[PDB]
Design a protein around this ligand. Structure first.
Ligand SMILES: CCCCCCCCCCCCO[C@@H]1O[C@H](CO)[C@@H](O[C@H]2O[C@H](CO)[C@@H](O)[C@H](O)[C@H]2O)[C@H](O)[C@H]1O
Length: 445
C-alpha cells in the first residue's frame, strides 16, 4: 500500500500498547504501597526487578519473532498476552501471588511485543528509518501522556463512587481496554498496512513451535512471579546477570553511561513518585489562581508532556551525553531545593514541573544517543546492563525510603531531598565522566 501507511499502523498499535503500559506504571508502586500493604523499600525493589525483567525480556522475544514465529505473529501474540496480563490485574483480589502472576504475564507479553513492533518500523523503511523512529518515539509519548493522565483519575473517581476495590482494578481495566483498542486497530489495518515485514511470517505458523513457545512462555510467567516475589531471588538473578554481562571497545563507556542514566531514570517511577505523594502540594496554581489539583501519580505525565513540548524546540558529539547529565543534575537540584523554598511540610508543585522539565530535557538529549549510536558501531549485553541498572535504580531510590509509621511530612521532606541532592551531585560526576572520555572518541576516528 504505502510506507507511511504501514508505519502508521505499527506506530498506532505502539501508541495504544504504551498507553496500557504507562497507565499501569503510573499506578503500580502506589498500588503496592497504598492498596496492597507494601513498604516502599519492597515496593521499589519489586517494581525495579519487574522493570529489569521487562527490559531484558525483549532480547529473547525479538529472536522469537524473527527466527521462530512471525514478527507480525509474535507482535500480535505479545499484544494478546499483554491484554491477559492487565485482565488479571483487574480481578479484585489482594492476593500478592495473583498480582505477581499478572505482572509475569506482562513481562512475557512485553518481551514478545516490543522488539517486533520495533522491527516492523525498520522493515517499513528499508535513513528515513530515523524519520520513522523519531515519530514513533513521539507516538509513544502522546499515548503515555493520555494514560498517565487518565488512569490515576479513574482510580480516584471509582475509589470514590465505590469502595477501595476496584478503584485500582478499574484503572488496570482501563489499561486492558487500551491494549484491546490497539489490537482492534491493527486488526482493522492488518495485511492492509503491514503487508510485507517479518522473516518467518511468509508461511503458516508452526504449531510445534507455537506449542513450545506458549509452554516456555507459561514457564517464564512463573519464573517472573517468583523473581518478583522473593527479593533474594531477584537480587541473586540480577547479580548473576551482572557478573555474566560483565564477563562477555568504544561502545563500552557508552553502555556504562547508559547504566548511570538509567538509575536517574528509574528514580521517577519510584522515589519521585513517593515524594510526590507525600511531600508535594497537589494543588497546581498558575500564579495566581487555582486550576487544577494533581493526583500524585499524574505528576509522571509531566515527562512525556515536556518531551513533547521541547522536542519541537530542540529540532531547531557524545557531548550531548554530557549536557544530558548536566541537565538531569539541575533537575534533581530543583527537587533538592524543594525544601529551601515552597514548603509547609508538604509543599512545592512547581518544583515538580521545573524538576521534570529539566530532567526530561536531559532525557530527550540522551533518548537518541543509545540504540542508533551502538547499532551504527551486543543487543543482549545492552539489554542486560539496562535491566540491571533499572534494578540498581530501585536500590538507589531506596536511599530515600520512609518507614511506614513515619507520616509527618515535615520529617519525610528531608529524606527525599537528601537523596535528590545526592543524585544531583552524582549526575555532575557523570557529566565529568562524559566530557573526560570525549577525546577517547577522537583517538579512534
Ligand atoms: C492523547 C493525549 C491526551 C492528553 C490529555 C488527557 C486528558 C486527561 C484525562 C483525565 C484528566 C483528569 O485529571 C485530573 O484529575 C484530577 C485529580 O483526580 C481531577 O481533579 C478534580 O477532582 C478533584 C476532586 O474532586 C477536584 O479537587 C479538582 O478541582 C478537580 O479538577 C481533575 O478533574 C482532572 O483534571
Amino acid at each position: 500500500v504505502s510506507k507511511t501507511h504501514s508505519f502508521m499502523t505499527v506506530s498506532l498499535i505502539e501508541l495504544w500498547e504504551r498507553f496500557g503500559y504507562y497507565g499501569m506504571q503510573a499506578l503500580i508502586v502506589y498500588f503496592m504501597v497504598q492498596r496492597l500493604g507494601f513498604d516502599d523499600s519492597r515496593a521499589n525493589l519489586v517494581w525495579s526487578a519487574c522493570a529489569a525483567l521487562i527490559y531484558v525480556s525483549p532480547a529473547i522475544g525479538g529472536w522469537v519473532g524473527d527466527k521462530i514465529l512471525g514478527t507480525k505473529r509474535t507482535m500480535l501474540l505479545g499484544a494478546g498476552i499483554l491484554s491477559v496480563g492487565y485482565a488479571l490485574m483487574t480481578v479484585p483480589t489482594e492476593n500478592t501471588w495473583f498480582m505477581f502472576s499478572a505482572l509475569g504475564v506482562i513481562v512475557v507479553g512485553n518481551g514478545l511485543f516490543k522488539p517486533n513492533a520495533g522491527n516492523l518500523v525498520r522493515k517499513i523503511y528499508e535513513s528515513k528509518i530515523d524519520s520513522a523512529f523519531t515519530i514513533y518515539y513521539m507516538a509513544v509519548n502522546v499515548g503515555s501522556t493520555f494514560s498517565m493522565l487518565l488512569t490515576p483519575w479513574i482510580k480516584d473517581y471509582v475509589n470514590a463512587q465505590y469502595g477501595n476495590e476496584f478503584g485500582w482494578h478499574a484503572a488496570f481495566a482501563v489499561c486492558c481496554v487500551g491494549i484491546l483498542v490497539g489490537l482492534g486497530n491493527y486488526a482493522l489495518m492488518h495485511k492492509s498496512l503491514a503487508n510485507y515485514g517479518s522473516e518467518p511470517d511468509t508461511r503458516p505458523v508452526n504449531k510445534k513451535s507455537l506449542a513450545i513457545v506458549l509452554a516456555l512462555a507459561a514457564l517464564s510467567v512463573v519464573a517472573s512471579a517468583i523473581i518478583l516475589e522473593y527479593e533474594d531471588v531477584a537480587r541473586v538473578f540480577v547479580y548473576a546477570a551482572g557478573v555474566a554481562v560483565l564477563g562477555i571497545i568504544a561502545a563500552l563507556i557508552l553502555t556504562v553511561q547508559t547504566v548511570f542514566f538509567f538509575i536517574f531514570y528509574q528514580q521517577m517511577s519510584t522515589s519521585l513518585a513517593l515524594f510526590a505523594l507525600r511531600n508535594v502540594d497537589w494543588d497546581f496554581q498558575v500564579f495566581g489562581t487555582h486550576l487544577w489539583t494533581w493526583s500524585p501519580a499524574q505528576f509522571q505525565a509531566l515527562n512525556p508532556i515536556w518531551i513533547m513540548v521541547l522536542s519541537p524546540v530542540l529540532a531547531w558529539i557524545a557531548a550531548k551525553f554530557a549536557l544530558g547529565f548536566a541537565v538531569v543534575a539541575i533537575g534533581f537540584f530543583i527537587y533538592g531545593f524543594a525544601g529551601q523554598f515552597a514548603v509547609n511540610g508538604k509543599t512545592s508543585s512547581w518544583v515538580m514541573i521545573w524538576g521534570y522539565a529539566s530532567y526530561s530535557l536531559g532525557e530527550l538529549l540522551v533518548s537518541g544517543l543509545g540504540l542508533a549510536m551502538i547499532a551504527r558501531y551486543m543487543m543482549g549485553a545492552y539489554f542486560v546492563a539496562s535491566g540491571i541498572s533499572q534494578y540498581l535504580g530501585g536500590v538507589v531510590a531506596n536511599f530515600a525510603s520512609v518507614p511506614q509509621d513515619l507520616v509527618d511530612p515535615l520529617q519525610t521532606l528531608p529524606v527525599y531531598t537528601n537523596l535528590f541532592n545526592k543524585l544531583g551531585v552524582a549526575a555532575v560526576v557523570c557529566t565529568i565522566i562524559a566530557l573526560a572520555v570525549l577525546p577517547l572518541m577522537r583517538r579512534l576516528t
